[PDB]
Amino acid sequence: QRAGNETPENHPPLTWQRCTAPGNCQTVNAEVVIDANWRWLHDDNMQNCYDGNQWTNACSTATDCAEKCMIEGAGDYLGTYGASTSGDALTLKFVTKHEYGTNVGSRFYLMNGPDKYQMFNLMGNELAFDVDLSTVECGINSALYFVAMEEDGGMASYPSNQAGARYGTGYCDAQCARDLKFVGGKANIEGWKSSTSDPNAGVGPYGSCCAEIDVWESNAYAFAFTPHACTTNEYHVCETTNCGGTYSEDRFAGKCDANGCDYNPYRMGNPDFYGKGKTLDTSRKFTVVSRFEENKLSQYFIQDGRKIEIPPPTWEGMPNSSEITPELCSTMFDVFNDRNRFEEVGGFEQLNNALRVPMVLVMSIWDDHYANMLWLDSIYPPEKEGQPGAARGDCPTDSGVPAEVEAQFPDAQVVWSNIRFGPIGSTYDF
Ligand SMILES: OC[C@H]1O[C@@H](O[C@H]2[C@H](O)[C@@H](O)[C@H](O)O[C@@H]2CO)[C@H](O)[C@@H](O)[C@@H]1O
Ligand SMILES: OC[C@H]1O[C@@H](O[C@H]2[C@H](O)[C@@H](O)[C@H](O)O[C@@H]2CO)[C@H](O)[C@@H](O)[C@@H]1O
Numbered sequence: 001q002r003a004g005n006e007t008p009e010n011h012p013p014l015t016w017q018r019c020t021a022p023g024n025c026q027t028v029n030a031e032v033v034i035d036a037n038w039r040w041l042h043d044d045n046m047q048n049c050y051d052g053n054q055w056t057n058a059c060s061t062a063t064d065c066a067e068k069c070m071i072e073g074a075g076d077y078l079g080t081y082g083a084s085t086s087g088d089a090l091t092l093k094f095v096t097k098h099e100y101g102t103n104v105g106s107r108f109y110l111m112n113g114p115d116k117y118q119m120f121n122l123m124g125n126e127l128a129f130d131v132d133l134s135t136v137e138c139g140i141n142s143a144l145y146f147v148a149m150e151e152d153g154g155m156a157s158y159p160s161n162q163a164g165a166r167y168g169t170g171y172c173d174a175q176c177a178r179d180l181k182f183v184g185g186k187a188n189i190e191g192w193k194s195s196t197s198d199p200n201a202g203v204g205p206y207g208s209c210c211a212e213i214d215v216w217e218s219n220a221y222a223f224a225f226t227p228h229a230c231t232t233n234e235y236h237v238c239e240t241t242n243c244g245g246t247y248s249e250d251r252f253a254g255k256c257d258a259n260g261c262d263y264n265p266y267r268m269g270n271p272d273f274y275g276k277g278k279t280l281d282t283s284r285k286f287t288v289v290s291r292f293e294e295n296k297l298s299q300y301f302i303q304d305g306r307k308i309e310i311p312p313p314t315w316e317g318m319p320n321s322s323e324i325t326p327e328l329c330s331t332m333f334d335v336f337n338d339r340n341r342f343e344e345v346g347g348f349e350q351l352n353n354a355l356r357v358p359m360v361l362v363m364s365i366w367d368d369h370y371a372n373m374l375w376l377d378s379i380y381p382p383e384k385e386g387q388p389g390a391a392r393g394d395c396p397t398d399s400g401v402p403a404e405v406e407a408q409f410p411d412a413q414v415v416w417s418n419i420r421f422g423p424i425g426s427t428y429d430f
Contacts, residue, residue, distance in 0.1 A: 001066045001071060001161055001187070002067070002070040003163045006072055007073040009033070009075075010077065011111060011114055012083060012085045013031050015087055016419040019422030019423075020422065022427065025427065031111040031113075031114065032083075032363075033111055033166060034083075034168045035108075036167055037107075037171075038107070038168075039072055039168070040071070040072045041056075041181065049069035049187075052194070052199055052200070053194040053195070053198060055187070061187070062187045064187075066182070066185060067160065071163050073167065079098055081096065082413075083108070088417050088419070090417060092106040092364075094411070094413060105367065106364065107362065107363070107364045107366075116165060117165050118361060119358040119359060119360060120146060120358065122146065122356065122357065122359050124292070124424060126289060126290060126291040126425065127289075127292070127421050129287070129417065129420065132417075133218055135412045136414055137405070138373065138377045138378070138399040139372060139405035140365065140373065141218070141219060143218070144216035144362065145361075145362050146215075146359030146362065147211065148357040149170050149210065150170060151358075152164050152165050154208075154235065155170070157185075161185035169182070172207075173228070174212035174228030174258045174260060176209040176248060179202070179203050183204065183206035184206060188204020188205065191204070197402060207245070208238065209236050210230060210233065210256075213292070219376065219395075220282045220283070221275055221282075221377045221393040222264065222266050222377040224267070225290070225297065225299050228257045228258065228259075228354075229257050229346065229353075230350075230354070231256070238255065244258055252344070257344075259339065260342060261328065261332065263299075263310070263324060266391060268315065270311030279308065286302065286303040286308075287303070287418065288301055291425070295325060298324070300430060302428060302430065315335060315336075315388055317335050337387070365414050368400060373395075373399075374397065374399075374400055375392065377395035377400075379392070380392055382397055
């Protein structure tokens with residue numbers, strides 16, 4: 001759609017840095033912007049083009065909304081979207097009760113200029129950073145990760161969206177975003193169905209799918225490293241039954257892997273390692289190092305100067321190592337006993353493909369209304385329990401209920417920072 005002229009869109013800064021040698025790294029005075037889903041929608045006279053989680057009378061069809069409406073800028077990322085920056089440091093406060101409402105969550109992208117995004121040289125390169133999720137409790141997710149959203153937020157490819165990257169347009173992942181207000185540069189208005197729980201969210205028949213690289217999915221109790229692969233690893237527009245993931249009728253009904261090949265440590269049987277005071281003690285800041293190599297993935301940590309390894313899986317049949325490999329991805333699925341879309345959409349090769357797609361460094365905090373994040377920090381799925389892969393973390397089963405969790409700790413926050421990138425083994429000396 002068009003750009004909203006009432007507000008000027010502010011893009012907070014955020015130094016990050018290419019890393020030549022493990023000591024000679026140089027800083028980039030980047031910036032950041034938020035996804036369009038958190039932005040106000042309206043016709044040429046204050047009246048919105050959507051509202052609550054219901055599209056409006058000021059709007060009619062997908063192809064009409066793209067032209068009749070426009071998106072505005074946020075501005076008070078502090079006072080409205082709870083974001084903050086300290087140079088390299090950044091902060092996103094879970095629950096954000098601004099003057100006229102209470103906004104839940106945030107999602108940001110790196111920016112090589114206000115028009116442009118920060119794409120990344122994935123394969124054969126590593127990503128670093130540091131996080132203080134020290135008070136990110138069960139039910140919540142502070143996520144850092146890459147995905148192949150086109151450099152200009154889908155503006156080139158789509159003529160009807162003349163807003164683009166500078167306002168946070170064109171997002172996709174392995175879930176396929178049916179929740180997106182707009183997709184392929186049109187509106188998700190025609191047939192739009194608003195859920196029960198989420199008064200902000202609904203779901204449209206048009207989701208956009210692309211390759212999804214989630215080195216980070218975490219919390220004070222558990223995490224996972226997870227690559228998702230697509231037939232088409234790049235931005236593509238799906239259509240209803242031919243959509244998969246979260247918002248669709250069948251999860252694996254698509255072009256993409258929404259379950260994927262995760263390393264979830266506690267899921268792999270090493271339950272006393274990560275957490276408050278634990279081996280990987282999450283009550284205080286620590287560093288993640290993630291490399292991305294052909295047919296293999298790796299990730300260390302560095303706490304109190306000390307380089308922390310990753311627990312190997314207990315599970316008989318399964319290979320002894322953290323490293324993401326086919327040996328993993330293969331001897332993983334009947335063992336745990338889940339539907340394998342990893343290789344159902346083309347093994348480590350399609351991901352060895354996915355890897356070589358230019359990516360963007362996302363940054364997010366949320367709360368899942370659909371699994372209550374049970375898939376990350378507890379016994380999932382609780383359709384039985386007592387088997388491998390069930391468990392996930394030290395968290396309980398009635399936790400993750402967005403509301404109730406949004407009521408006990410609404411001031412929790414993630415602190416993203418020290419982001420590093422470069423050739424393999426070149427952001428730290430380990
Ligand atoms: O609550 C803030 C924001 O929610 C947006 O929907 C989010 C959803 O809550 C989150 O769980 C999911 O990961 O992303 C979707 C949108 O991508 C909603 O679009 C906004 O109106 C609202 O400001
Ligand atoms: O559906 C919840 C959640 O699933 C995440 O992947 C899950 C998968 O759906 C679940 O069935 C399996 O047991 O665990 C994996 C991850 O460990 C998916 O990535 C999320 O987007 C989704 O909300």
